[PDB]
Design a protein around this nucleic acid. Structure first.
Ligand SMILES: [Mg+2]
Ligand SMILES: [Zn+2]
Lengths: 99, 489, 497, 119, 302, 447
DNA sequence: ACTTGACATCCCACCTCACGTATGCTATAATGTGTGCAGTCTGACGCGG
RNA sequence: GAGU
């Protein structure tokens, strides 16, 4: 089984699981650790954004690949936004501070 | 929005007003037949944003031509659906309720600020006994428990000067009135004359809390919640299974109960209901609120219609199945494939067998770009049509992309960094991935049906890091000891 | 002694959060005297209501808002609902014949005029006038007004007292906080004179350097007193009799409210028991119990001791009803009007019987037969009958998945198709360039291509320069030439889609 | 060395210290630089040992610590502290989908650090 | 996670002294193995082949190590990750070789996670493996006899023994080791002998090849008396602190002194002893010292 | 009916039968789990109950259990073992009266077993008298050693009572370590029937029994002579012996060919005997899938050579001959099921027709007028089986789209591609098709 | 190249209709109750008392 | 039910 693009998850907007959904494999914290052991930051970032929850980023990088660019240009993963909103639901203020 | 830092503090009730766009008055979600959002309901379009892109409720106004258009009849703003992930709503709580987290979780900042044990606070909150806020009379000062008729034996004789109340609202009041500045200074002066050991330790702790509190600028009255923020609808979405059936988040059921009980409290207030039932309702309000935040912390939790405990906001963040570990520090990824490993004696050290059909799928977009640039396909639509038939040409383009590309092989568990290695993939017939014998030791892999994942670093940078830093041929020595991992077996 | 038993049990309460226990404890202390005890407090209801009505007959403004609000709806031709249905509904100790209304209002006006003449002669209430005032009040006791209207009349007096006390509070705020004056001396002087200015300068007559300071803003001080005095004038009530009415009315109201408190708390046990029958896994125990209490409220207020029948019997229905209606409307995520709910109820009662007759199941046709409803309608109801199943439902029998781990967003046009639409727009502008400048802008504007807005034929004609019909021909010319495979090499592929 | 991350202060600086406070070894050396060069009253310190879990929970990266364990507790403490996470560590950037400050990401990350000095 | 190489060298002189680990039975891990690829702090001196000196701040490569092997220096102050001056992270120098690469570590590489993965890895492996290959259970516990391998002098450090009737040099010290001197005076071989172990050759005398110099029974640590006379019983009552096991025949028994678990509530503080009295009665004292010999028999001392 | 169907459907103990082979089914039926209501879960189970008790002797196989967190919890019933009166485990044992070994069997529970002194089956027995050795090999009160003849009360029926059904099939278990033994029983459970059944060269005698009880084979219940033989019908004329003077003496066995198992595996019966053959009561008329003439035919037997190859057999990897495919051995029949659903949205009722907008007529060609795939047609992954149309609703013409719709025409007919696709990379033949029309709407042509 | 007018087809908005929805009212007497499973582990740091 |  293999997946490039297909159906994504409802809440997190991550790729689904299983051959049944045309799902992608989870690249887990274990795998993360491997990348970290190497200095491999851009691969990791791929896995975190263009490959998963960043909509604008994955679509843009798709088009870049066809065009022969291979530039990343990352966005914000949806999971992190999920996180923010759930914290504010708990009445806990989390703001991302400007420079 | 290119950022430096993240700060966390108590949410002010009026700050919660700020984030919230509209008040959710009704427990209803949507109409049963027409599944459109209900007015001031949980999935309200007027509050949380429009269901469908650039199209209002009643449906007179659509198209990009209308952006920021505010439909006069329905009160629907015309914009992107995406807003339903980001607008918050809110609830006006009739009885200021205490936040469970700051009570039942240790140490419990309320308890430690007031140097008051849990039980006292409980009996107060649960309306079992009254407590003294402000005593003009020397007989009793701050934090005294009074029963039913002790309060009467107190009220009858004194009153006038004598201030006491019951419940979370009383505690809110005691929170505002306690002197932030003075007490800090008092404690250090206490320290100056005499410090028996353990007393000075606890007094020290308290000093730390207090100072930290007033430096951060967090106000104690914020412990008591007046406004209850409500999570964006997309995060608690309501969806039909294809068989007509529905699935809804557990958040929705807890929230619904919250609203139901709050509305009943409005009715009971307007009716001037007797104390006993008013008190009972405040218990119930507190329950629902605290269940919504963290269910079961408070003792016996609300269950599923099943039997299964309802999943609270806390579970969503915290659990191992919570957001952190399942969706944030790790996730499912595209451009990866997975299948059984088979021996590749003929492969070189930096190589691996990559099954035809797997690689076809993986490298899809690379295919399209070159298809269009070489003019083999008129446009991208035709390139897709040309991939889905599968002629000789397709394979050749795949060949050219795969040439000098490195791909990553992964085996779970990721014991060490060499649980993922980079290889030059070589296409083969069949559905089985071929692995080089030498590197079996590092993956601790053996040929008895183990599967591996194969990820594609897509960018030039990813490719670079894979071939340079992660390449099999680059990493022979264990980072653990200096000795070789990739070796005879 | 009852409270003492409460407190000993409370000393043992081992943090049992179960509100069941808590409520059970409190109610457990309160005993219930029956038979006549109930009727006792019912009598207190009646006398409270009549109290306020006596005031309405006796009070100047009260009769005014009566006739004044009769004209609003009746004068306009001939009206019988809205305001009239809110009012009236009278009991002489229901379709209201015009004949009776004409008669019942007639004797009022005559009484009004005669009751005015005596007021003026000599005193406010000199002896005879006091006796006739009492008889006037006894005439009004006869009528009962419907609750909805009664509120607003009660409201005019309630807020008037607020105005009185608040005006004094604001006056004494500035006076006592900025100026300074002992309230004991206040008592005598204000109660004696009120209306005349003697008390103003007599107070300063006690001397002492502070009293003389007052001239710099002299105008403001006594003119502000004028606001209060003007309330006196417009109210038209003398302070000797003003107090009497307001406080006495206050008394009536308090009697009634506290009396009901006793009554309601005595009947707690009844509500709870009746609720626990329908506790039957619909919502929660406690929610039900709360709804039942609302039913008792209703029972209390519409309960009549005159009926001569047991309270339990009557209240039972109100509490029972509250519970039924509440489950129907709350309960499910999909809120449902009751007509649909009642139909569902029929369904399932019949289901049991039919399964037992057939030895198996009920097909829609056979079911539809017995109900005499259209099969389509039955099937509709069957589908609508499905309750919210949880999105968080552990789909994994092994705690693998919270249903959500299936759900995909079909809203998302796929990155495949998004690439497609991009290529399409780019291709469109390039073929636009092939056209003649203004021809290009014609089609560009006509379809909003590369503009936030679409202009139709007439609006394009306006912006172009008169020509409307020529634009039809231009559209056709573009069509004709763009059909040519030359410019349309790029567009050709998209014909398949 | 990670387990040695924290120390205990005897004696006030110009800062938020005082008797028995359990502050990071890094913040102590930062105070050193700035105070020794300018003067002000000195602060006496002693090194402390924390094992694993506690050490992790003690670090000034509350999203790091929140990702570890005791999510509930750590959040509340940081919320009351009004704590400000400056985001120098790894998992922080991980979660935000940023450039790891290790290795390949070193370049970009030091650039942001110099941009802090320039206003 | 936060530990990364930020600096090349902060300039610390501090460091940790690493030895060749001579834990008991042998030199299980030598200095070379422990130190390879590390930066050194300071120079160590030893009277050696020609008065050894070794320049500091230097990373010790394989070949450096070979040279120092011929000198046979014992203790080396090596600049450590811990003794690093760098804030939030460490120095290239303080860390040393990145084992996987062969060279000095690259500045910026996350050494923290490096260490963690390496150390978690084997734990996870060494569980799984002897759990699905070792289908039974046993351990090398025949700690019976010591055996000197090469011909040298016997020389003891840290003990105080007391000579008996049968004639064994019985060790009563917890701090005992039994080493081996070669031709011109060095500590070659090392053994660890526990309390109660019979010896053969004491201090000074030469042992020929593969001769039995120490001896003790494994499954049983005896407590051995330093002085003579009659055994006097103190606080060993039956049920409180000891359990009667007696047979018929001529009427022999073997007392078992039970620990805390089997003791009733009254016999909690009772410390059971065997007091050393003489033929006359009175506390005979251990030679030269003041102790009236009262040997505290521990929990379950049969 | 709710509570019953609760138990039957939702409970832990009610599971999909494993029908990979008859062994799988039979073993599953008699497996015994420590979970369920009144029982333990995974965390709730420590070493206590998981570990191997001496009592398990002749009652549970000590050697048959899922590896991983399920281990210790679920265990197969040993061969000869059954439940006693009170649902306690018991084993049949032979009496031994005064030295001589009697012929009587008694079933004993664990409690009963503790009491008596039992010789192993392995102990050597003098022909219908006593024991051959003076000092003999037995166990009493749960503990093994040497006893003399007179003291010995009972004895094992056979060795195979120690082990479960799965474990009993393995031939030389005696020389195999328990770890691999465990894995062996497990793998046997996952074996799939091929096209061509082969009897195992090395069996145990149990291979007849196993098949017999599996009951997927068809067995003669009277005996007599076979009157008619069909690959679908086996009809037998009984001897007047077993013949009822009431009814007629003809017994009819309709066989089932190629039905789908839960695992997607093959369930086909082949007739064994021939027309006019005289057979006895309890003869094997027709074989189930992995069954030869009476015997378990789990798999197939090949000439293996133990040797290292040029790293094609590296680490337990397998080198194999093209001859295997030549003979068609180890070829599986998989009967896969797919369902096409025509639902009703309020968007409009979906319909099944041959009507499929913008499809290649390649895909249209194989469909009947109803939109149903032809019987027996061979297709591939992606190919359309059953046609379906669904209510669409467009009108979102962003500017550029309107332009082209005008020019070329191609007038858009509202309909999604609901039509029934075949799964990815999968290709086989349609063996059969089924149609269920709801009562409301009228009959389909194909239906 | 463009306009004009005629005649013929299509798109937007407001009105009467009909079903759908919201809330009230019922009188023999009915008045202290529900309810379960959680657990067994297991070393652990911690406060409370 | 797979393997580490
Ligand atoms: Mg394997
Ligand atoms: Zn609208």
């Amino acid at each position: 089984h293999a997946r490039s693009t297909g159906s994504y998850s409802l809440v997190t907007q991550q790729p689904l699981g299983g051959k049944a959904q045309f799902g992608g494999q989870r690249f887990g914290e274990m795998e993360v650790w491997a990348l970290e052991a190497y200095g491999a930051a851009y691969t990791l970032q791929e896995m975190l954004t263009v490959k998963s929850d960043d909509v604008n980023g994955r679509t843009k990088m798709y088009k870049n690949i066809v065009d022969g660019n291979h530039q990343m240009e990352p966005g914000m993963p949806e999971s992190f936004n999920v996180l923010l909103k759930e914290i504010r639901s708990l009445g806990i203020n989390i703001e991302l501070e400007d420079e | 929005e290119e950022f430096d830092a993240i700060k966390i503090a108590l949410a002010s009730p009026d700050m919660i007003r700020s984030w919230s766009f509209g008040e959710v008055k009704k427990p209803e979600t949507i109409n049963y037949r027409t599944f459109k959002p209900e007015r001031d309901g949980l999935f309200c379009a007027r509050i949380f944003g429009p269901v469908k892109d650039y199209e209002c409720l009643c449906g007179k106004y659509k198209r990009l031509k209308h952006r920021g258009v505010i439909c006069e009849k329905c009160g629907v703003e015309v914009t992107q659906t995406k807003v339903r992930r980001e607008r918050m709503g809110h609830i006006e709580l009739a009885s200021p309720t205490a936040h469970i987290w700051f009570l039942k979780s240790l140490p419990s900042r309320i308890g430690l600020l007031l140097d008051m044990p849990l039980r006292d606070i409980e009996r107060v909150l649960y309306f079992e006994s009254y407590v003294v806020i402000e005593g003009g009379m020397t007989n009793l000062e701050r934090q005294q428990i009074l029963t039913e008729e002790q309060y009467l034996d107190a009220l009858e004789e004194f009153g006038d000067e004598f201030d006491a109340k019951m419940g979370a609202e009383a505690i809110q009041a005691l929170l505002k009135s306690m002197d932030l500045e003075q007490e800090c200074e008092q404690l250090r002066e206490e320290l100056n004359e005499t410090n028996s050991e353990t007393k000075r330790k606890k007094l020290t702790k308290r000093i730390k809390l207090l100072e930290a509190f007033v430096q951060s600028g967090n106000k104690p009255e914020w412990m008591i919640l007046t406004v209850l923020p409500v999570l964006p609808p997309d995060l608690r979405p309501l969806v039909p299974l294809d068989g007509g059936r529905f699935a809804t988040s557990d958040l929705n059921d807890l929230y619904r109960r919250v609203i139901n009980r709050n509305n009943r409290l409005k009715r009971l207030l307007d009716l001037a209901a007797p104390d006993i039932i008013v008190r009972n309702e405040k218990r119930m309000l507190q329950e629902a609120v605290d269940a919504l935040l963290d269910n079961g912390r408070r003792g016996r939790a609300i269950t599923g219609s099943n039997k299964r405990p309802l999943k609270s906001l806390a579970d969503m963040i915290k659990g191992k199945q919570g957001r952190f570990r399942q969706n944030l520090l790790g996730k499912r990824v595209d451009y990866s494939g997975r299948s059984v490993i088979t021996v590749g004696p003929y492969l070189r050290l930096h190589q691996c067998g990559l099954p035809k059909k797997m690689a076809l799928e993986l490298f899809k977009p690379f295919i399209y770009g070159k298809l269009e640039l070489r003019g083999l396909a008129t446009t991208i639509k035709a390139a897709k049509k040309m991939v889905e038939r599968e002629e000789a040409v397709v394979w050749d383009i795949l060949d050219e992309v795969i040439r000098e590309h490195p791909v990553l092989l992964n085996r779970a568990p990721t014991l060490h960094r060499l649980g993922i290695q980079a290889f030059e993939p070589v296409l083969i017939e069949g559905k089985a991935i071929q692995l080089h014998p030498l590197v079996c030791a590092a993956y601790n892999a053996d040929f008895d049906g183990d599967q591996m994942a194969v990820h594609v670093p897509l960018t030039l940078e990813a490719q670079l890091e894979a071939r340079a830093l992660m390449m099999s041929t680059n990493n022979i020595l264990s980072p653990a000891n200096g000795e070789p991992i990739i070796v005879p077996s | 002694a009852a409270a003492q038993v409460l407190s000993s049990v409370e000393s043992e309460i081992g943090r049992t959060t179960d509100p069941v226990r808590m409520y059970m404890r409190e109610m457990g202390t309160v005993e219930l005297l029956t038979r006549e005890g109930e009727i006792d407090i019912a009598k207190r209801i009646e006398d409270g209501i009549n109290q306020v009505q006596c005031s309405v007959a006796e009070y100047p403004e009260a009769i005014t808002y009566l006739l004044e609000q009769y004209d609003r709806v009746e004068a306009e031709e001939a009206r019988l609902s809205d305001l009239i249905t809110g009012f009236v509904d009278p009991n002489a100790e229901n379709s209201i014949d015009p004949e009776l209304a004409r008669e019942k209002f007639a004797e009022l006006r005559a009484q009004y005029v005669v009751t005015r003449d005596t007021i003026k002669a000599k005193g406010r209430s000199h002896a005879t006038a006091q006796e006739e005032i009492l008889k006037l009040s006894e005439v009004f006791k006869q009528f009962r007004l419907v609750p909805k209207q009664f509120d607003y009349l009660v409201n005019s007096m309630r807020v008037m007292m607020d105005r009185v006390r608040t005006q004094e509070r604001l006056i004494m705020k500035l006076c006592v906080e900025q100026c300074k004056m002992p309230k004991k001396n206040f008592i005598t002087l204000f109660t004696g004179n009120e209306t005349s200015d003697t008390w103003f300068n007599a107070a300063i007559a006690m001397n002492k350097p502070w009293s003389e300071k007052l001239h710099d803003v002299s105008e403001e001080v006594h003119r502000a007193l004028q606001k209060l005095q003007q309330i006196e004038e417009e109210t038209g009530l003398t302070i000797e009799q003003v107090k009497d009415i307001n406080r006495r009315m206050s008394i009536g109201e308090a009697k009634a409210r506290r009396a009901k408190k006793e009554m309601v708390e005595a009947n707690l046990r009844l509500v709870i028991s009746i609720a626990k029958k329908y506790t039957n896994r619909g919502l929660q125990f406690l929610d039900l119990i709360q709804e039942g209490n609302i039913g008792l409220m209703k029972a209390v207020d519409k309960f009549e001791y005159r009926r001569g029948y047991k309270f339990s019997t009557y209240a039972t229905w109100w509490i029972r009803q509250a519970i039924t209606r509440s489950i129907a409307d709350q309960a499910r995520t999909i809120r449902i009007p009751v007509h649909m709910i009642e139909t569902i109820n029929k369904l399932n009662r019949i289901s049991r019987q039919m399964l037992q007759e057939m030895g198996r199941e009920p097909t829609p046709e056979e079911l539809a037969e017995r109900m005499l409803m259209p099969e389509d309608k039955i099937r509709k109801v069957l589908k609508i009958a499905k309750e919210p199943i949880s999105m968080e439902t552990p789909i994994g029998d092994d705690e693998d998945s919270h249903l959500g781990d299936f759900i995909e967003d079909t809203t998302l046009e796929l990155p495949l198709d998004s690439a497609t639409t991009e290529s399409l727009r780019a291709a469109t502008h390039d073929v636009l360039a092939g056209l003649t400048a203004r021809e290009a802008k014609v089609l560009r504007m006509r379809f909003g291509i590369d503009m936030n807005t679409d202009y139709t034929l007439e609006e394009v004609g306006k912006q172009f320069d008169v020509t409307r019909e020529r634009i039809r021909q231009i559209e056709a010319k573009a069509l004709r030439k763009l059909r040519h495979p030359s410019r349309s090499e790029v567009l050709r592929s998209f014909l398949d889609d | 060395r990670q387990m040695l991350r924290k120390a205990t202060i005897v004696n006030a600086g110009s800062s938020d210290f005082l008797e028995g406070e359990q502050v990071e070894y890094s913040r102590v050396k930062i105070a050193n630089r700035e105070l020794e060069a300018n003067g002000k009253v000195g602060a006496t310190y002693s090194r402390d040992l924390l094992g694993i879990t506690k050490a992790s929970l003690a670090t000034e990266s509350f999203i790091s610590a929140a990702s570890f364990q005791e999510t509930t507790r750590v959040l509340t403490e940081a919320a009351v502290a009004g704590k400000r996470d400056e985001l120098r560590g790894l998992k922080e950037n991980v979660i935000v989908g940023r450039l790891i400050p290790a290795g390949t990401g070193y370049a970009y990350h030091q650039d942001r650090m110099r941009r802090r000095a320039a206003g | 996670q936060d530990l990364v190489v930020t600096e090349d060298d902060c300039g610390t002189h501090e460091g940790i002294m690493m030895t060749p680990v001579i834990e008991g039975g042998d030199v299980k891990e030598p200095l070379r193995d422990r130190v390879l690829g590390r930066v050194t702090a300071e120079d160590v001196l030893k009277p050696g082949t020609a008065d050894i000196l070794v320049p500091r701040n230097t990373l010790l490569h394989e070949q450096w190590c070979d040279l120092l092997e011929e000198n046979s220096v014992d203790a080396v102050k090596v600049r450590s990750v811990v003794s690093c001056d760098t804030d939030f992270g460490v120095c290239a120098h303080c860390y040393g070789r990145d084992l996987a690469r062969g060279h000095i570590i690259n500045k910026g590489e996350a050494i923290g996670v490096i260490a963690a993965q390496s150390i978690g890895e084997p734990g996870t492996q060494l569980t799984m493996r002897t759990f699905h290959i070792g289908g039974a259970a046993s351990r090398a516990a025949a700690e019976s006899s010591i055996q000197v391998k090469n011909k040298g002098s016997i020389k003891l450090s840290n003990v105080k023994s007391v000579v008996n009737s049968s004639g064994k040099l019985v060790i009563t010290s917890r701090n005992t080791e039994l080493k081996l001197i070669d031709e011109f005076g060095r500590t070659k071989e090392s053994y660890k002998v526990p309390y109660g172990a019979v010896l053969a050759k004491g201090d000074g005398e030469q042992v020929a090849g593969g001769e039995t110099v120490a001896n003790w029974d494994p499954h049983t640590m005896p407590v051995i008396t330093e002085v003579s006379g009659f055994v006097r019983f103190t606080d060993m009552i039956d049920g409180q602190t000891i359990t009667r096991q007696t047979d018929e025949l001529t009427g022999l028994s073997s007392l078992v002194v039970l620990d805390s678990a089997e003791r009733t509530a009254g016999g909690k503080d009772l410390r059971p002893a065997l007091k050393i009295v003489d033929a006359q009665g009175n506390d005979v004292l251990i030679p030269g010292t003041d102790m009236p010999a009262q040997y505290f028999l521990p929990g379950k001392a049969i | 009916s709710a509570a019953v169907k609760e138990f039957f459907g939702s409970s832990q103990l009610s599971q999909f039968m494993d029908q990979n082979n008859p062994l799988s089914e039979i073993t599953h039926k008699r497996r015994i789990s420590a979970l369920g209501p009144g029982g333990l879960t995974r965390e709730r189970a420590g070493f206590e109950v998981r570990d191997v008790h001496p009592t398990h002797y002749g009652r549970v196989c000590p050697i048959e259990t899922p590896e991983g967190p399920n281990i210790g919890l679920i265990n197969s019933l040993s061969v000869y073992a059954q439940t006693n009166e009170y649902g306690f485990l018991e084993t049949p044992y032979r009496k031994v009266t005064d030295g001589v070994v009697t012929d009587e069997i008694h079933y004993l529970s664990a409690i009963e077993e503790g009491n008596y002194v039992i010789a192993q089956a392995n102990s050597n027995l003098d022909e219908e008298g006593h024991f051959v050795e003076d000092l003999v090999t037995c166990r009493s009160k749960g503990e093994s050693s040497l006893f003399s003849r007179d003291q010995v009360d009972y004895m094992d029926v056979s060795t195979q009572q120690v082990v479960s059904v799965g474990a009993s099939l393995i031939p030389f278990l005696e020389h195999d370590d328990a770890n691999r033994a465990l894995m062996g029983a497990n793998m046997q459970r996952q074996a799939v029937p091929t096209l061509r059944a082969d009897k195992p060269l090395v069996g145990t005698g149990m291979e007849r029994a196993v098949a017999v009880d599996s009951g997927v084979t068809a067995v003669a219940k009277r005996g007599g002579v076979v009157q008619y033989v069909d690959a679908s019908r086996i009809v037998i004329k009984v001897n007047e012996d077993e013949m009822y003077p009431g009814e007629a003496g003809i017994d009819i066995y309709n066989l089932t060919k190629y039905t789908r198992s839960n695992q997607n595996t093959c369930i086909n019966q082949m007739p064994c005997v021939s027309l006019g053959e005289p057979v006895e009561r309890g003869d094997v008329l027709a074989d189930g899938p992995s069954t030869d003439l009476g015997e378990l035919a789990l798999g197939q037997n090949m000439r293996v050579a133990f040797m290292p190859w040029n790293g094609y057999n590296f680490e337990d990897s397998i080198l194999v001959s093209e001859r295997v495919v030549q003979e068609d051995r180890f070829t599986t029949i998989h009967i896969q099921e797919l369902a096409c659903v025509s639902r009703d949205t309020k968007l409009g009722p979906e319909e099944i027709t041959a009507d499929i907008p913008n499809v290649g007529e390649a895909a249209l060609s194989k469909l009947d007028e109803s939109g149903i795939v032809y019987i027996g047609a061979e297709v591939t992954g992606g190919d359309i089986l059953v046609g379906k149309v669904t209510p669409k609703g467009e009108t979102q013409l962003t500017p550029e789209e309107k332009l082209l719709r005008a020019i070329f025409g191609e007038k858009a007919s509202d309909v999604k591609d609901s039509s029934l696709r075949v799964p990815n990379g999968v290709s086989g033949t349609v063996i059969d098709v089924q149609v269920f029309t709801r009562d409301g709407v009228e009959k389909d042509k194909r239906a």
